[PDB]
Scaffold this active site. Structure first.
Site, PDB file in Angstrom:
ATOM      1  CB  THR B 259      -0.910  -0.016   1.225  1.00 11.09           C
ATOM      2  OG1 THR B 259      -0.119  -0.240   2.399  1.00 11.09           O
ATOM      3  CG2 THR B 259      -1.941  -1.114   1.124  1.00 11.09           C
ATOM      4  CG  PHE B 384      -5.456   5.839   5.460  1.00 13.59           C
ATOM      5  CD1 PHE B 384      -4.375   4.976   5.348  1.00 13.59           C
ATOM      6  CD2 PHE B 384      -5.318   7.141   4.996  1.00 13.59           C
ATOM      7  CE1 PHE B 384      -3.180   5.398   4.790  1.00 13.59           C
ATOM      8  CE2 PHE B 384      -4.128   7.571   4.441  1.00 13.59           C
ATOM      9  CZ  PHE B 384      -3.052   6.698   4.339  1.00 13.59           C
ATOM     10  CB  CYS B 391      -5.276   2.532   7.913  1.00 11.25           C
ATOM     11  SG  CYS B 391      -3.509   2.210   7.841  1.00 11.25           S
TER      12      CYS B 391
HETATM   13  C1  HEM Z   1      -0.736   4.308   2.040  1.00  9.83           C
HETATM   14  C2  HEM Z   1      -0.630   3.161   2.729  1.00  9.83           C
HETATM   15  C3  HEM Z   1      -1.822   2.429   3.382  1.00  9.83           C
HETATM   16  C4  HEM Z   1      -3.110   2.375   2.999  1.00  9.83           C
HETATM   17  C5  HEM Z   1      -3.763   3.029   1.750  1.00  9.83           C
HETATM   18  C6  HEM Z   1      -3.826   1.557   3.962  1.00  9.83           C
HETATM   19  C7  HEM Z   1      -5.169   1.257   3.923  1.00  9.83           C
HETATM   20  C8  HEM Z   1      -5.895   0.591   4.882  1.00  9.83           C
HETATM   21  C9  HEM Z   1      -7.323   0.359   4.863  1.00  9.83           C
HETATM   22  C10 HEM Z   1      -8.281   0.832   3.749  1.00  9.83           C
HETATM   23  C11 HEM Z   1      -7.650  -0.329   5.971  1.00  9.83           C
HETATM   24  C12 HEM Z   1      -9.059  -0.809   6.372  1.00  9.83           C
HETATM   25  C13 HEM Z   1      -9.211  -2.245   5.877  1.00  9.83           C
HETATM   26  C14 HEM Z   1     -10.595  -2.788   6.105  1.00  9.83           C
HETATM   27  O1  HEM Z   1     -11.490  -2.046   6.593  1.00  9.83           O
HETATM   28  O2  HEM Z   1     -10.816  -3.992   5.803  1.00  9.83           O
HETATM   29  C15 HEM Z   1      -6.430  -0.560   6.722  1.00  9.83           C
HETATM   30  C16 HEM Z   1      -6.314  -1.228   7.922  1.00  9.83           C
HETATM   31  C17 HEM Z   1      -5.132  -1.520   8.563  1.00  9.83           C
HETATM   32  N1  HEM Z   1      -3.866  -1.126   8.187  1.00  9.83           N
HETATM   33 FE1  HEM Z   1      -3.427   0.086   6.613  1.00  9.83          FE
HETATM   34  N2  HEM Z   1      -2.930   1.142   4.920  1.00  9.83           N
HETATM   35  C18 HEM Z   1      -1.693   1.663   4.608  1.00  9.83           C
HETATM   36  C19 HEM Z   1      -0.528   1.484   5.322  1.00  9.83           C
HETATM   37  C20 HEM Z   1      -0.414   0.746   6.484  1.00  9.83           C
HETATM   38  C21 HEM Z   1       0.769   0.629   7.310  1.00  9.83           C
HETATM   39  C22 HEM Z   1       2.104   1.344   6.994  1.00  9.83           C
HETATM   40  C23 HEM Z   1       0.470  -0.185   8.343  1.00  9.83           C
HETATM   41  C24 HEM Z   1       1.355  -0.648   9.527  1.00  9.83           C
HETATM   42  C25 HEM Z   1       2.693  -0.597   9.513  1.00  9.83           C
HETATM   43  C26 HEM Z   1      -0.913  -0.596   8.196  1.00  9.83           C
HETATM   44  C27 HEM Z   1      -1.598  -1.434   9.051  1.00  9.83           C
HETATM   45  C28 HEM Z   1      -2.960  -1.623   9.096  1.00  9.83           C
HETATM   46  C29 HEM Z   1      -3.703  -2.369  10.099  1.00  9.83           C
HETATM   47  C30 HEM Z   1      -3.094  -3.114  11.310  1.00  9.83           C
HETATM   48  C31 HEM Z   1      -5.002  -2.301   9.777  1.00  9.83           C
HETATM   49  C32 HEM Z   1      -6.173  -2.934  10.546  1.00  9.83           C
HETATM   50  C33 HEM Z   1      -6.565  -1.981  11.671  1.00  9.83           C
HETATM   51  C34 HEM Z   1      -7.702  -2.539  12.479  1.00  9.83           C
HETATM   52  O3  HEM Z   1      -8.714  -3.005  11.892  1.00  9.83           O
HETATM   53  O4  HEM Z   1      -7.589  -2.515  13.731  1.00  9.83           O
HETATM   54  N3  HEM Z   1      -1.416  -0.010   7.048  1.00  9.83           N
HETATM   55  N4  HEM Z   1      -5.388   0.011   6.027  1.00  9.83           N
END
Ligand code: HEM
Ligand code: HEM
Lengths: 451, 446
Positions: B259, B384, B391
């Site tokens: 991502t 996000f 996120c």
């Molecule tokens: C531009 C980069 C990123 C984008 C566009 C992005 C996007 C997203 C999105 C859309 C979700 C929601 C997913 C869902 O509802 O099913 C999510 C959840 C999550 N992301 Fe990211 N992400 C990015 C970078 C990162 C990074 C750098 C990390 C950690 C080092 C990360 C860790 C997580 C985690 C752990 C979740 C789940 C949170 C939860 O439900 O408690 N992401 N992300």
């Protein structure tokens, strides 16, 4: 190690610095100059003002610090008695009343107060609907009418009928003048010419006690049951001691609800509307939610919970101008604050909430900007960075009440009217023991949506 | 009232529509034809794709909808376990890890990760400084080297050393191949299954070993592993167990690396395709990054770079969808009745092209759309995710991307030397495949 301290006045130390009409704002300016902690000395008094989340998170450790009665609270205690806000944690009546009253202030309990809150909110909306063209709204004056009447109705089923009056109910006049004397005493030698103030103070105390004692006695004689806090207090029993509140303490709690709630809450509504008319993009976003969510002529409890962005607006208004702007703590034992400030048992701390809420190490460089989007997810906000309702077991028991009242009323205001800042109002914050935007006025043009 | 639906294939319903190399882009084309909502049916599966801010603002009401594990997330769960991204909100380990990990992902915690992020960013800059004349840069390849190494270093003080390698670290090979199998299962084998379990073992073995090593060492670093070994959930008072910590580490590598590198790749793509925007961003980089090494405070000052990244996320959000289910019976948009448990998919790239929100120029790259967040309507911009299931790594990703893009714009002029034609390769994330540029150094020392 060595603690900064503002300018002194000979034997009076720092005390004359509070002899100003805007003492919280003066203390904020001192915190701007001196930093996260400064000592404040007066004859027979030493305290330390905290402004950083770093130090305040430690002060909020209940194993190390307990609530202290500031001089303001000690003076309010002369008419709030051992009500919740002016009692020490170790006083039997604090924990007793806390246990009895907590369930009647919960989020679930707001369902029972909702109808009475709507009653007063509709009165406010109708007042503004009935204004003539080019008449205007005195915002804090009307917000205070609403919050006082709402606490009166929810507190003990009494109608101050503030929207039927120019001069307030005699109880309100005595309460405001009692709070004024309490504040004036802070900035004051006990010269013989203060005898008039003192005699009036005791007269105002009697006015408040008489009306509240009379309503309690009336209620006990009638035996009638309402959806108000007075009914809960007449029927409640502390699970710990097994005791109910006595009639005198019930009176102090009712007086306390009126003091602690009316001015803080109306200030919040006033500041919120001020920031909305100064930030039209935010207003539009909040009004869109209001129109989408409040689809019935009368808001429901569940609909108010859906006003997420309105709630974000209120939190950001509380961030910038928390209307109960400080609270006091004492060290339970010898301890070291922040690794460099040793405190002895009994040493006092003041938490300067508006300064805390401007801590750039928490909020970023844009602390002075009004951006409800900071509060999209409250869980992300760091611990003890946002403290408009105090701390721990001594936090505001009326928080859910205040926020339900403010969310309902602001939501209805945004649903029913477009607002104009017709004077380009210049923010002027009048200080009592609380904060409000003095002289804030708007014009409201009805959207012609029936109630 | 009646909900549109794309073409069907007899008993297979709509499922063959996903048997395509670019399924998100195909779904976007269906949304173009059918509008803000369409039903998508498969054998034993019904979902509804939302594309308008009007309906998605309701879907983001957490009192009415909760996160659903999409079929993709269910397959990723086979190796991400009950890490944050592949756990249900009602699972004990979600709220526990959420409460524990939130302070280590805050804007304030980025101050502690900054030095390690700079470590990898400087390696990227030096790689490009050391290229010979008429050599070029494989942009997503190098961005993935950077984001992978940054999460390894900030996540658990491990150096993948991707800039020393052509063939990736054995963990990455299994992770990528596991994600490939997860995606392929959607469009769909004994060899695949045996390989899938082998890759799971590779990931578990290395991560369990690093956890065991750290506990044996007792050393304390500025990484997420230290926080997880020492943290306690304020609610339950419990720490995460070693198995869940492993799944969180695997999750960080999965959820963040591709991502974030996709974001950097798309951002640079849009910059070189919009030279006036690149110049404005390069002007900010030179004015703000006055020291050989960017500081944390300087990265926060890269306002226009932050707008560039948000606009890149608007056009091509690299985690392009998320799934929701109705907590109770409810009516969406006043005309689409949903029963409890009914599923929704949020098609983020389509949402971000809602002309009623952004105007008629939705396809143009204009970071200036993000001057004031208060002007943007509620739930119009969701790269996000949403609510408590948003996120957790958002501040991490944007700090890393802003730092790296700022240094790139300070140190090099870029040439779109092939007049690159955008070709978006789809895994579970999105990237501009074959995107290449030339970089001419401004000869500014580090
Ligand atoms: C531009 C980069 C990123 C984008 C566009 C992005 C996007 C997203 C999105 C859309 C979700 C929601 C997913 C869902 O509802 O099913 C999510 C959840 C999550 N992301 Fe990211 N992400 C990015 C970078 C990162 C990074 C750098 C990390 C950690 C080092 C990360 C860790 C997580 C985690 C752990 C979740 C789940 C949170 C939860 O439900 O408690 N992401 N992300
Ligand atoms: C926006 C409006 C309000 C704000 C900002 C506010 C703020 C506060 C703060 C900061 C404290 C802690 C004081 C200290 O530590 O010395 C407190 C305590 C208290 N508040 Fe409020 N308050 C509000 C509304 C209300 C309302 C509506 C009520 C009741 C009807 C109420 C009743 C109380 C009581 C009883 C306490 C003392 C609780 C205890 O110590 O046991 N407040 N409030």
């Amino acid at each position: 190690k060595e603690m900064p301290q503002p300018k002194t006045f000979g034997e009076l130390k720092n005390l004359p610095l509070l002899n100003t009409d805007k003492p919280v704002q003066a203390l904020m300016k001192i915190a701007d100059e001196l930093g996260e902690i400064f000592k404040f000395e007066a004859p027979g008094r030493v305290t330390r003002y905290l402004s950083s989340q770093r130090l305040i998170k430690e002060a909020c450790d209940e194993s190390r610090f307990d609530k202290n009665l500031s001089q303001a609270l000690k003076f309010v205690r002369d008419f709030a008695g051992d009500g919740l806000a002016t009692s020490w944690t170790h006083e039997k009546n604090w924990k007793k009343a806390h246990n009895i009253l907590l369930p009647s202030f919960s989020q679930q309990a707001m369902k029972g107060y909702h109808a009475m809150m709507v009653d007063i909110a509709v009165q406010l909306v109708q007042k503004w609907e009935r204004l003539n063209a080019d008449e205007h709204i005195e915002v804090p004056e009307d917000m205070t009418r609403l919050t006082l009447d709402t606490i009166g109705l929810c507190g003990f089923n009494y109608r101050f009928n503030s929207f039927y009056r120019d001069q307030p109910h005699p109880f309100i006049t005595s309460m405001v003048r009692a709070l004024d004397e309490a504040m004036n005493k802070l900035q004051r030698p006990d010269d013989p010419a203060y005898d008039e103030n003192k005699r009036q103070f005791q007269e105002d105390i009697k006015v408040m006690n008489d009306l509240v004692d009379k309503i309690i006695a009336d209620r006990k004689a009638s035996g009638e049951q309402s959806d108000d806090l007075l009914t809960h207090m007449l029927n409640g029993k502390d699970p710990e001691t097994g005791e109910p509140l006595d009639d005198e303490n019930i009176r102090y709690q009712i007086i306390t609800f009126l003091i602690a709630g009316h001015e803080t809450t109306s200030g919040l509504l006033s500041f919120a509307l001020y920031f909305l008319v100064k930030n039209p993009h935010v207003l539009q976003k909040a009004a869109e939610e209001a129109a989408r969510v409040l689809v019935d002529p009368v808001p429901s409890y569940k609909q108010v919970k859906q006003l997420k962005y309105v709630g974000m607006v209120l939190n950001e208004a509380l961030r910038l101008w928390p209307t109960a702007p400080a609270f006091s703590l004492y060290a339970k034992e010898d301890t070291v604050l922040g690794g460099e400030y040793p405190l002895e048992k009994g040493d006092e701390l003041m938490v300067l909430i508006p300064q805390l809420h401007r801590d750039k190490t928490i909020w970023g460089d844009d602390v002075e900007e009004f951006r409800p989007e900071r509060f999209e997810n409250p869980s992300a906000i760091p611990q003890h960075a946002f403290k408009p309702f105090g701390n721990g077991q001594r936090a505001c028991i009326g928080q859910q009440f205040a926020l339900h009242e403010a969310t309902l009323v602001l939501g209805m205001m945004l649903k029913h009217f477009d607002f104009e800042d017709h004077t380009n109002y210049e923010l002027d914050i009048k200080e009592t023991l609380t904060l409000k935007p003095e002289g804030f006025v708007v014009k409201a043009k009805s959207k012609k949506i029936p109630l």
